[PDB]
Write a protein that binds this ligand. Sequence first.
Ligand SMILES: CC(C)CN(C[C@@H](O)[C@H](Cc1ccccc1)NC(=O)O[C@H]1CO[C@H]2OCC[C@H]21)S(=O)(=O)c1ccc(N)cc1
Lengths: 99, 99
Amino acid sequence: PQITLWQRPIVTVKIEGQLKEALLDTGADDTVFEELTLSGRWKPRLIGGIGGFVRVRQYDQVPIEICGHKVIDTVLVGPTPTNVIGRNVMTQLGCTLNF
Amino acid sequence: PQITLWQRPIVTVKIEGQLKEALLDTGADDTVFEELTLSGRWKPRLIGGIGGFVRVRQYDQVPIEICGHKVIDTVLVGPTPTNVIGRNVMTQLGCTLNF
Ligand SMILES: CC(C)CN(C[C@@H](O)[C@H](Cc1ccccc1)NC(=O)O[C@H]1CO[C@H]2OCC[C@H]21)S(=O)(=O)c1ccc(N)cc1
């Protein structure tokens, strides 16, 4: 697929049985969701963005279905105004910036 | 050009005589720089990211040299940990996400 950027590049994901939408975000190192219940152990983490810092839970080896592809990666769960799919997942999608 | 996402997609830009680096950021609606001096008038604006909001100056019709292209767009100037090139500029670059 090719995704133009006239609009926010939002995609539908399925993670641990839950359906969500998220922004394909080349500026995000990590994948981050606000309201997502994930199972298992997690480590406390702080990430920093434009308006300051938020405390998140780091969950590892989380299954994600996105763009006709199933991938497994680290998902951070914490306050964010927008769910974001980070480079960690995009490199696995074989996703590139082309122009 | 094609930019893979194994590393942050940082690019060199020239804006109003000044040389800077910035992240090609599909999750950013707008282009934002921290330490860029721009000429003319501006409007006060607040943008929201992860962690909270920041006050920025909005400058219109700023020429930007990026990726062999000269483009002209709105640049927000304010506190950000990382300069980001937003979709406003990327659409002009003909820049797309491919996988
Ligand atoms: C500033 C970037 C280097 C990092 N940010 C990713 C970025 O794409 C966010 C992604 C984003 C999107 C919406 C809300 C919060 C964060 N966009 C953003 O802050 O854009 C601002 C400039 O344009 C405006 O348009 C949308 C928000 C404004 S980030 O959200 O802070 C971030 C940081 C670390 C991780 N792992 C994931 C995301």
